[PDB]
Amino acid sequence: MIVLFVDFDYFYAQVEEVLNPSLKGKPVVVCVFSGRFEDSGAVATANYEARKFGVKAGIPIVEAKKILPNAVYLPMRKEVYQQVSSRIMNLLREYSEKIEIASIDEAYLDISDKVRDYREAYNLGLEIKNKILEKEKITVTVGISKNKVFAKIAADMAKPNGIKVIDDEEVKRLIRELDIADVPGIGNITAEKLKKLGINKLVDTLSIEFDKLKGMIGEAKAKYLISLARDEYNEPIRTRVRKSIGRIVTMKRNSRNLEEIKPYLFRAIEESYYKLDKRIPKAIHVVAVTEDLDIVSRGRTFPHGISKETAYSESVKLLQKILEEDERKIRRIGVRFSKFI
DNA sequence: GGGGGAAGGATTC
DNA sequence: TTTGAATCCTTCCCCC
Ligand SMILES: [Ca+2]
Ligand SMILES: [Ca+2]
Numbered sequence: 001m002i003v004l005f006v007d008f009d010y011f012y013a014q015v016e017e018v019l020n021p022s023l024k025g026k027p028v029v030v031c032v033f034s035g036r037f038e039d040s041g042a043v044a045t046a047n048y049e050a051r052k053f054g055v056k057a058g059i060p061i062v063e064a065k066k067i068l069p070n071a072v073y074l075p076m077r078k079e080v081y082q083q084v085s086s087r088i089m090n091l092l093r094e095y096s097e098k099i100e101i102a103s104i105d106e107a108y109l110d111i112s113d114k115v116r117d118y119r120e121a122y123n124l125g126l127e128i129k130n131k132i133l134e135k136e137k138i139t140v141t142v143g144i145s146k147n148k149v150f151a152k153i154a155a156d157m158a159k160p161n162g163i164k165v166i167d168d169e170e171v172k173r174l175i176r177e178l179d180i181a182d183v184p185g186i187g188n189i190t191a192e193k194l195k196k197l198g199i200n201k202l203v204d205t206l207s208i209e210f211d212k213l214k215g216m217i218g219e220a221k222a223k224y225l226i227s228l229a230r231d232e233y234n235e236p237i238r239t240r241v242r243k244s245i246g247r248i249v250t251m252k253r254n255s256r257n258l259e260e261i262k263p264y265l266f267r268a269i270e271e272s273y274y275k276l277d278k279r280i281p282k283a284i285h286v287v288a289v290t291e292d293l294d295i296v297s298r299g300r301t302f303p304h305g306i307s308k309e310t311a312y313s314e315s316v317k318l319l320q321k322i323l324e325e326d327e328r329k330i331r332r333i334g335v336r337f338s339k340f341i
Numbered sequence: 342g343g344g345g346g347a348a349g350g351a352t353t354c
Numbered sequence: 355t356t357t358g359a360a361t362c363c364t365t366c367c368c369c370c
Contacts, residue, residue: 032357032358034356034357034358040356040357041356041357041358042355042356042357042358043356043357044358057354058354058355058356058357059355059356060355060356060357061356061357062356063355063356076358103354103360185353185362186353187352187353187354188352188353189351189352189353190352190353218362218363218364219363219364220362220363220364221362221363242360243360243361244359244360244361245359245360246359246360247358247359248357248358248359250357283347285348285349289357293355293356293357295349295350295351296349296350297348297349297350298348298349299347299348299349300347300348301346301347301348332357332358334358334359336359336360
C-alpha cells in the first residue's frame with residue numbers, strides 16, 4: 001500500500017490571509033471567544049509569525065494578547081473554512097477514489113492503483129500541492145509512506161509547506177528512534193503513562209508485558225502501538241462519516257436554575273439542528289460543565305429519529321436528571337446529537 | 342463466557 | 355489552562 005496524506009498548513013489562519021492578503025507577514029490569531037467577559041476564551045490556531053512567540057492553539061486569548069498585543073485577532077469562521085476545505089478535498093478526489101477525510105484540514109489518499117513507486121508518489125504529491133496553491137492559494141504539506149500513520153508522521157516532519165516520503169527503511173528506523181509521543185493518536189495523558197513504563201520508542205512495547213500495557217493505556221491503544229512496533233499496521237483507507245453534532249455554550253453566570261439554563265440549552269439545540277442539515281439523529285445527550293470545570297452528561301437513545309420538539313422535551317429531562325444527580329452549579333450547558341438514520 | 346448496544350467519563354485535537 | 359468539537363474507550367447491563 002502507498003499512502004499520500006495531505007495536511008493544510010495553519011489552515012484557519014491561512015484562510016483568513018487568503019481572504020485578506022494584507023494579513024500576510026503579520027501574526028494572525030484565529031480565536032473562539034467564550035463571552036463570559038472581555039477576551040474570554042481560547043485560540044483555535046495561529047499562523048507561524050504568531051507561533052514564533054508562543055501564541056498557539058489552546059492558549060487563552062488573554063495570554064496571547066499579552067505576548068502579541070498588536071497581532072491580528074479574528075473570530076473563528078468555521079463555515080467559511082469548511083467550504084474552502086470541501087473544495088480542496090474535491091480537488092483531491094481527482095487523484096484517487098479511495099480518500100479518507102480525517103478532518104477539515106487532513107485527508108488520506110490510497111494511491112496504490114495510481115502510482116508504482118515513491119518517486120511517482122512524490123511527483124503526484126507536487127502535482128497535488130501545485131494544484132491546490134494555484135486553484136485555492138493554500139499551501140499544504142504532503143506525507144507519503146506505507147500506511148496512514150507513517151504518512152501522517154511524514155507530514156508532521158515536513159510541515160509547513162513541505163513534502164516528505166518515508167520508505168520501508170526509514171520506517172524500521174523510526175520504529176526504533178521516533179519519540180513515541182509523536183505517534184498519531186498518542187496524546188499527553190497517554191504519552192506520560194508510556195514514559196512510566198520505560199517506553200519512549202515504538203520498539204519498547206514489544207518487551208513489556210501485554211497485560212501491563214493493556215492495563216495502563218488500554219487494550220485498544222496497546223494493540224495499536226504493538227501493531228506499529230511489529231510493523232504490521234492494520235487499518236485501511238475507508239470513508240469517514242461525521243457521527244455526532246453538537247453545541248456547548250457559556251452562561252453569563254453559574255446556576256442550577258432550570259428556567260435560567262433553558263434559554264441556553266434551547267439555543268444549543270437550534271444551532272445543533274441547523275448543522276444537522278437533513279441528518280436525522282436517534283440519540284441525544286446533554287452536556288454540563290460544572291463550576292469546578294468538571295464535565296457531566298446524560299443522554300438517551302430512541303428507536304426512531306428525533307424531531308426538534310422531541311429534542312426540546314427530552315433535553316429538559318436529561319438536564320433535570322443532571323441537576324438531580326449533581327449538586328454543583330452549572331457554568332456551561334450544551335447538547336449533542338448522534339446515531340443518524 | 343461473551344455478543345451487542347447503551348451510557349457516560351476520558352482523551353485527543 | 356481555557357476552552358470548543360468530536361471521538362475514544364472502558365464499563366455496565368440485558369440475556370443467550
Ligand atoms: Ca494543518
Ligand atoms: Ca489539523
